[PDB]
Amino acid sequence: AQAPVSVIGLGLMGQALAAAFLKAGHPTTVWNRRAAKADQLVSEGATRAGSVADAIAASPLVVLCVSDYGAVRELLDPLAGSLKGKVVVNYTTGTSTQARETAEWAAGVETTYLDGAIMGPPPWLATDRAILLYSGPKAAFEEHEATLRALGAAGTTYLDTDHGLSALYDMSLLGIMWGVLNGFLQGAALLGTAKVKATTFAPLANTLINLITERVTAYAPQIDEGKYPAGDATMTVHQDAMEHLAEESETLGISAEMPRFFKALADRAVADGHADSGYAAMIEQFRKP
């Protein structure tokens, strides 16, 4: 109690946010375009705001989670005068550029605005797996740190004052997640041709995912120094193995699109004269517009 919060936007991630605040004993007011998306929470103790104004007026902490920043502007523009003395935390997925622009607007209507990024599925909220990054005024963050930590004590992390940093980190970590899921999906498509079940491949795949973190830590400084030694394998070795994965995919009858794509990037790596460097030299390829 004594710390009301309003969640504007009741999607899957929004609902999880309102639930976390409710369970944590915070007076939680919710609002969503489709009112039906707020019934469960209201029946569980949440206060249903009839309008965006009702939600904004219910608490000093206003949490935003909608589809796009376009929906963010549409909801925040008509109340630029109603945000006096409040703090706005926006968990909506967007680009760093969109984050800074909404900050500019916020800075103009004299209101505290925090840009937040939720890293992972809604089920991770209010669990040990929850990771939430914040960017903006460090003061406002600390004012509500107790309230914010209801969504994940250990995972809460204040980034800095640059409002776009949260979105940037959000985008960078998302590429990692899709890279893992797609890699796993490509591997599961293969072993399925041998009547191997995805569940059977899941533990082995996860063992390898966890271990590769070691290589991740190894290539990190090489990306910083600009020197890419080939202590584990040369780009040519990678290129060859990528060709085997491509060829194996076409043979077994599954998509070889991703293998071809990976081998294409290795082509340019060796094309740039990095055939005898470690995979870290791939950073140059990803820096090319």
Place this chain on the structure above:
Amino acid sequence: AQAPVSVIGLGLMGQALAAAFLKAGHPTTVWNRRAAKADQLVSEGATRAGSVADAIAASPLVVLCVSDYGAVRELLDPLAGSLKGKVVVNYTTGTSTQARETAEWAAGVETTYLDGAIMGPPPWLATDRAILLYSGPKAAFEEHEATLRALGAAGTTYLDTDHGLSALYDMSLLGIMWGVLNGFLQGAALLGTAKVKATTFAPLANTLINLITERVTAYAPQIDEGKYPAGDATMTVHQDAMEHLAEESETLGISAEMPRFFKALADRAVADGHADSGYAAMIEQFRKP
């Protein structure tokens, strides 16, 4: 000791394999097309064979690890009669088909053949992080399991009698490594634009890579069931986030090829009517030639 082993092919992974046998006290004989690449091993207590013939005779367990299955045929075929009373272990990277064609050739010459797959960089061998998959006659694996353990006791696994299973599992795991690494490189390029040094982003990435295994575990049964519910995020939400990552990359002057490629697969999913399914539905896109 008491278990002499021969290692044919002394590149990076062959040198590490031999170095493990030597470190475990095995009388280790090495051979490489280029002799100089074995001088380091001889000064450390390894015996250099002048020819493949000497190496084959030197030990009852012959471990191969060369540039490709093309060289395995080049070196094995001339020794069809000299392979009696011996066990050949081929750690070369190749397709499931190649591992079978090689496995069938061995049956003709009445030699014991085990198709081995080494998961991870060379330096993981002889540590708790080494993953080594074996395919073939169980009796052969059981009879030389102690010798093979020198490269990794916790990773030494027997897959079954299908010799290509190793190459398959190998191939499947290769995709996961490039996905994680490429995803990490993509994010490193993004955060690099904001002067975020890679070693500062590595630990965070490693936290997500570790976490995402939970999502891998969740999708595994949906893949085997053919039902892809959207409890975390629908294909639509995945789609919108990929576009943002794509716009973000282009805005920051880096490569949007991987993001735009990730979105293409997602669009194909929505094109097949999976806009309301979870990401496990993309398995159908990887099953498409």
